[PDB]
Amino acid sequence: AWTPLEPKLITRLADTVRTKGLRSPITMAEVEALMSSPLLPHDVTNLMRVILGPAPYALWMDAWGVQLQTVIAAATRDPRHPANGQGRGERTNLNRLKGLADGMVGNPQGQAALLRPGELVAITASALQAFREVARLAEPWADIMQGPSESFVDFANRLIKAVEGSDLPPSARAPVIIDCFRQKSQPDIQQLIRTAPSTLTTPGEIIKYVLDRQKTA
Amino acid sequence: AWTPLEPKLITRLADTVRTKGLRSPITMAEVEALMSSPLLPHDVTNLMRVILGPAPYALWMDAWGVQLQTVIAAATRDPRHPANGQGRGERTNLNRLKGLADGMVGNPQGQAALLRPGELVAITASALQAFREVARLAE
Amino acid sequence: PWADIMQGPSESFVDFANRLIKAVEGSDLPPSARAPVIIDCFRQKSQPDIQQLIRTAPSTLTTPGEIIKYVLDRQKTA
Amino acid sequence: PWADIMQGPSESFVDFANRLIKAVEGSDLPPSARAPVIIDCFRQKSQPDIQQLIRTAPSTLTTPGEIIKYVLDRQKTA
Amino acid sequence: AWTPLEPKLITRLADTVRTKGLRSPITMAEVEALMSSPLLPHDVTNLMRVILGPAPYALWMDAWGVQLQTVIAAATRDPRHPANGQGRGERTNLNRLKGLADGMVGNPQGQAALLRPGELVAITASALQAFREVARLAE
Amino acid sequence: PWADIMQGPSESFVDFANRLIKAVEGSDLPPSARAPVIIDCFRQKSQPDIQQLIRTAPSTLTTPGEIIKYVLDRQKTA
Amino acid sequence: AWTPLEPKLITRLADTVRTKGLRSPITMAEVEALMSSPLLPHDVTNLMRVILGPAPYALWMDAWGVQLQTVIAAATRDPRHPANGQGRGERTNLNRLKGLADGMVGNPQGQAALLRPGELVAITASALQAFREVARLAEPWADIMQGPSESFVDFANRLIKAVEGSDLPPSARAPVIIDCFRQKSQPDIQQLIRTAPSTLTTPGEIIKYVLDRQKTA
Amino acid sequence: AWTPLEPKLITRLADTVRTKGLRSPITMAEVEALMSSPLLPHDVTNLMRVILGPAPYALWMDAWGVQLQTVIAAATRDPRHPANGQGRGERTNLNRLKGLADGMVGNPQGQAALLRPGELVAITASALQAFREVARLAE
Amino acid sequence: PWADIMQGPSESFVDFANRLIKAVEGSDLPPSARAPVIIDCFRQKSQPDIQQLIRTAPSTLTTPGEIIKYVLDRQKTA
């Protein structure tokens, strides 16, 4: 049985997006919150229709379609997808993912009837990634320096934000964050990281080490 | 069957962490509250992704891994771990604890299927101790 | 009225796109005729600098989102 | 003479292509040397706006018809 | 036996294309008129060589090739094509459609000998659609 | 009283360490609580130059003798 | 039989190091040239004694020792090293690599007699890596911009040089070079790379594309 | 037994490439000269590392890979390749051509041991064609 | 004479290290006594800023190359 999301939560989320913007970490946290239970295509579509303006909504429809197409390519590349079945008769078409298949167009009850839980979670993850892309697109890591008066946790927050919300591949973020900690982060912390008796191979470990041995001031 | 945590509670906890900080006793009490039922690796991972910033989240991943490794050392030091079994075929690998094992990567339903309750409580206690370490370290 | 919407001389492109998509989706057109109309209105409205920017697109843009992304990338910062 | 044909400052591109293909096919070249010559004359004649339009082609154009289609698509409407 | 189209009709059609353009409904009607009987690849090729300028002729060759390729994809998707046969030995290659196959290159008589009526009507419909595309593209 | 001992602005570090260890060992603390107290008093007393010198220790110092050796090595000769 | 390197080539290389420095690409090319045939520890040691000053020579001895120790750790981690043998009696000690073993100290002829070709090539590669480290140490990629008048091949050369001669892991150089091509390389080439109908996933492919479609001027 | 190329010849060739450029006929003649004996992948790789700058070296690695892939396609299209053998156990993989196969990575002696003369001449011709492509592309 | 070598007020550290290593290795000392002498001359010469920089080394430096690397890393850029 389909239950709609509260319009009160949706109104609060829309005002959050209106004041804080699309890219603030609080906004992404709120979206993750309202993206907790697996939503039907109807739910996510109406949610993005309400919280996003017209042009961001067009961009988001595009990005969601592209991500769903990547998902369907991975699905035809592996017959063991939680959305797929074992036989060929359970293969999931994009009409079933976007809610365009037969018995689903405009009807959320029938949608919830025919859809699989794997289908729902795949649609939800696709929509979240599309939202991230559009947010990064609507509004530079290599220009980030630690200010003379700025603390180190603020600098690390800003740098990790700008590196993860950028065009780098996922497998290239940690080395870049480390090498930016080492070359930015004004020469006191540079020498503090350089003279590390242990080898630090993770941004979290570097942050912990620097927070331990930092010059209290 | 897996049931997700309410995004309303998660939003309230995130704002609590945002205003009070990581180390306040009220924040630790709230975390203990949302750490009441044994959570699956997916739940704790997403929870820490939402409530913690990027750098505290990296620190927490590190600390959680270290604590889970200590747990697995104690487990290989005692075949009577509530996560282990009696035979050698039930020995619990870190891929099964971190949710990286086969049939679990990205799927919370399969996760909840294959995991043991002892596994869940050990993961939960490890995550709580890691949160305490990171909170003591950040400020 | 969607067919009377022009991008002002001082207006940014995201505001123009928002206004146009709003007026086109909140109109009497069929649902299957909104995307082509939005594209062809991006091409003929959206004052001649952006018109030439869309015209000289080495790739073929077949979606309002793709056109918006392309224009936002290659727009004249001013 | 084909090697003296330039696209005039005010001439359209289809007229220039017609004139060039006419002069190249009605000349003393072998039949197997007309297409490469027509392409390389499209690239070096056809005043620098279209020259840069052909240069920055994300795809490789290997036929006069394909070059004509691409230029007609992405040409600066004026 | 192959019979060529009248050069008088072709001259009148060429002057029609010259004065009215490629896209006028009278021009498309005249083309449909001269596209009534199924033409051999030689006929359509020479017709487009005469009535179209050099650049529209290049565009039309491209479009005709693309449409014929779509036809051949549909033909390999259905063994009951009026150009195909029942066995695999009657499958129609693009060399046979464009008139490039053996015994056909430059010879319209041999062309008319080996070609099927389904082949002829498919080639003709493909050429008409290509003409429509190029006319919509030129102006 | 051990908890009232500060390193004077002009006092050397070995004198401060001697005074502090004397007052901590000659007090009412249990024997198992003297080393942690001596360490944490080295860290919070011992005026901010030596405080920062101990804070930025690439190694972890877990003994009063090791802290004394490190500080004596890297101290500001003056 | 041992043949010494020409003192004329060594004098020319020493003057090259004296005028151009340790880090110039021409100097590294010249060193690679004189590092072509596998050299005995005597040869490399005397070569670095002559071309390098006293302090860079001390640094280079340190770095060479460290790299040789890493090599010997990999050798004890794999009994199939081209310097090792199958039995335990052919295991290669650092005294044999540094030329300190019995029958080798000060004698290049005996050195050439007892040494293996795998030993020679390992020593040579170790010495080259140590030279690179010391050159990078004696005298920043994220500060490299393409000048308004600079060509693109010069900018690419400078950037690839600074990225490969840095402290990044080997698996993080290509993504960094690509993302630096995209964000540096003044906005004309930035837009040229952005509007690429194909996806460029290699620095060589990006360089080829830009060289093809660049604005001749 | 592997013998390295003289660093004197390599230095002279590098200065030739530095003053005359990549495309001069004298430079191509010098490259053909130093490309006379069949070189091992190690030799050609180090040679191009020394004589070419960083960006031309990246371009050359790309082009060399593409040409070697064309060679391997022709090799799987003909079991009588001088690099191949008669049985299927002598089929030459790209790891063996680029010097990445087992027993060859970083070791020129083992390389010279396992490689065939046909393999060497194919690698050499591929590298020469790749150099020509990159030289035509750079300027 | 090696024992008379001081780092000048304006001299860089690599020049001082070069001069000192030259004078120590080209002297009458045994080969097994050069490294300790070079280290102890780095520590006592090399004007008090670098003296304190070497003194406050959280790690133990037991080689002239390691001392040179450490000082070059943490030196006061000026």
PDB file of N, CA, C and O in Angstrom, chain E residues 107-126:
ATOM      1  N   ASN E 107      26.258  -1.101 -65.434  1.00  0.00           N
ATOM      2  CA  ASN E 107      25.435  -1.724 -66.462  1.00  0.00           C
ATOM      3  C   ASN E 107      23.981  -1.742 -66.015  1.00  0.00           C
ATOM      4  O   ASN E 107      23.626  -2.523 -65.120  1.00  0.00           O
ATOM      5  N   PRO E 108      23.109  -0.919 -66.600  1.00  0.00           N
ATOM      6  CA  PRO E 108      21.700  -0.939 -66.184  1.00  0.00           C
ATOM      7  C   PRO E 108      20.948  -2.172 -66.655  1.00  0.00           C
ATOM      8  O   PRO E 108      19.988  -2.584 -65.994  1.00  0.00           O
ATOM      9  N   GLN E 109      21.349  -2.770 -67.779  1.00  0.00           N
ATOM     10  CA  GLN E 109      20.666  -3.965 -68.264  1.00  0.00           C
ATOM     11  C   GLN E 109      20.847  -5.126 -67.299  1.00  0.00           C
ATOM     12  O   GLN E 109      19.868  -5.743 -66.855  1.00  0.00           O
ATOM     13  N   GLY E 110      22.099  -5.442 -66.961  1.00  0.00           N
ATOM     14  CA  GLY E 110      22.344  -6.458 -65.953  1.00  0.00           C
ATOM     15  C   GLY E 110      21.698  -6.127 -64.626  1.00  0.00           C
ATOM     16  O   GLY E 110      21.164  -7.015 -63.958  1.00  0.00           O
ATOM     17  N   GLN E 111      21.713  -4.849 -64.241  1.00  0.00           N
ATOM     18  CA  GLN E 111      21.002  -4.415 -63.043  1.00  0.00           C
ATOM     19  C   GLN E 111      19.548  -4.867 -63.086  1.00  0.00           C
ATOM     20  O   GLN E 111      19.088  -5.609 -62.211  1.00  0.00           O
ATOM     21  N   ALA E 112      18.819  -4.449 -64.123  1.00  0.00           N
ATOM     22  CA  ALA E 112      17.424  -4.851 -64.270  1.00  0.00           C
ATOM     23  C   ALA E 112      17.260  -6.358 -64.315  1.00  0.00           C
ATOM     24  O   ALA E 112      16.204  -6.870 -63.928  1.00  0.00           O
ATOM     25  N   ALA E 113      18.279  -7.084 -64.779  1.00  0.00           N
ATOM     26  CA  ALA E 113      18.185  -8.539 -64.829  1.00  0.00           C
ATOM     27  C   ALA E 113      18.160  -9.147 -63.428  1.00  0.00           C
ATOM     28  O   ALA E 113      17.248  -9.906 -63.086  1.00  0.00           O
ATOM     29  N   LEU E 114      19.148  -8.813 -62.597  1.00  0.00           N
ATOM     30  CA  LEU E 114      19.323  -9.518 -61.333  1.00  0.00           C
ATOM     31  C   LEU E 114      18.444  -8.984 -60.208  1.00  0.00           C
ATOM     32  O   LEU E 114      18.226  -9.701 -59.224  1.00  0.00           O
ATOM     33  N   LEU E 115      17.947  -7.758 -60.314  1.00  0.00           N
ATOM     34  CA  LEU E 115      17.217  -7.143 -59.214  1.00  0.00           C
ATOM     35  C   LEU E 115      15.800  -7.698 -59.108  1.00  0.00           C
ATOM     36  O   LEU E 115      15.187  -8.091 -60.103  1.00  0.00           O
ATOM     37  N   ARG E 116      15.284  -7.721 -57.874  1.00  0.00           N
ATOM     38  CA  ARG E 116      13.928  -8.129 -57.554  1.00  0.00           C
ATOM     39  C   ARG E 116      12.994  -6.924 -57.573  1.00  0.00           C
ATOM     40  O   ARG E 116      13.431  -5.787 -57.372  1.00  0.00           O
ATOM     41  N   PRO E 117      11.695  -7.132 -57.809  1.00  0.00           N
ATOM     42  CA  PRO E 117      10.757  -6.002 -57.710  1.00  0.00           C
ATOM     43  C   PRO E 117      10.660  -5.434 -56.307  1.00  0.00           C
ATOM     44  O   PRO E 117      10.536  -4.212 -56.144  1.00  0.00           O
ATOM     45  N   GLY E 118      10.707  -6.289 -55.285  1.00  0.00           N
ATOM     46  CA  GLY E 118      10.778  -5.794 -53.920  1.00  0.00           C
ATOM     47  C   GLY E 118      12.025  -4.972 -53.672  1.00  0.00           C
ATOM     48  O   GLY E 118      11.979  -3.936 -53.003  1.00  0.00           O
ATOM     49  N   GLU E 119      13.159  -5.419 -54.218  1.00  0.00           N
ATOM     50  CA  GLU E 119      14.376  -4.619 -54.159  1.00  0.00           C
ATOM     51  C   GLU E 119      14.157  -3.251 -54.784  1.00  0.00           C
ATOM     52  O   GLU E 119      14.553  -2.225 -54.218  1.00  0.00           O
ATOM     53  N   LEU E 120      13.510  -3.217 -55.948  1.00  0.00           N
ATOM     54  CA  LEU E 120      13.311  -1.955 -56.649  1.00  0.00           C
ATOM     55  C   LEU E 120      12.427  -1.011 -55.847  1.00  0.00           C
ATOM     56  O   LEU E 120      12.739   0.178 -55.708  1.00  0.00           O
ATOM     57  N   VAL E 121      11.325  -1.523 -55.294  1.00  0.00           N
ATOM     58  CA  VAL E 121      10.425  -0.638 -54.555  1.00  0.00           C
ATOM     59  C   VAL E 121      11.069  -0.175 -53.253  1.00  0.00           C
ATOM     60  O   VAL E 121      10.858   0.967 -52.825  1.00  0.00           O
ATOM     61  N   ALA E 122      11.876  -1.026 -52.613  1.00  0.00           N
ATOM     62  CA  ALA E 122      12.569  -0.593 -51.404  1.00  0.00           C
ATOM     63  C   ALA E 122      13.590   0.494 -51.714  1.00  0.00           C
ATOM     64  O   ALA E 122      13.669   1.504 -51.002  1.00  0.00           O
ATOM     65  N   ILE E 123      14.380   0.303 -52.775  1.00  0.00           N
ATOM     66  CA  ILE E 123      15.325   1.333 -53.202  1.00  0.00           C
ATOM     67  C   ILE E 123      14.594   2.633 -53.501  1.00  0.00           C
ATOM     68  O   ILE E 123      15.049   3.722 -53.127  1.00  0.00           O
ATOM     69  N   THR E 124      13.446   2.541 -54.175  1.00  0.00           N
ATOM     70  CA  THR E 124      12.711   3.739 -54.560  1.00  0.00           C
ATOM     71  C   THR E 124      12.176   4.485 -53.343  1.00  0.00           C
ATOM     72  O   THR E 124      12.301   5.713 -53.254  1.00  0.00           O
ATOM     73  N   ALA E 125      11.573   3.763 -52.397  1.00  0.00           N
ATOM     74  CA  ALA E 125      11.071   4.409 -51.188  1.00  0.00           C
ATOM     75  C   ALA E 125      12.206   5.022 -50.380  1.00  0.00           C
ATOM     76  O   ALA E 125      12.065   6.121 -49.821  1.00  0.00           O
ATOM     77  N   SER E 126      13.344   4.327 -50.312  1.00  0.00           N
ATOM     78  CA  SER E 126      14.505   4.862 -49.612  1.00  0.00           C
ATOM     79  C   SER E 126      14.973   6.160 -50.256  1.00  0.00           C
ATOM     80  O   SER E 126      15.267   7.143 -49.564  1.00  0.00           O
TER      81      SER E 126
END
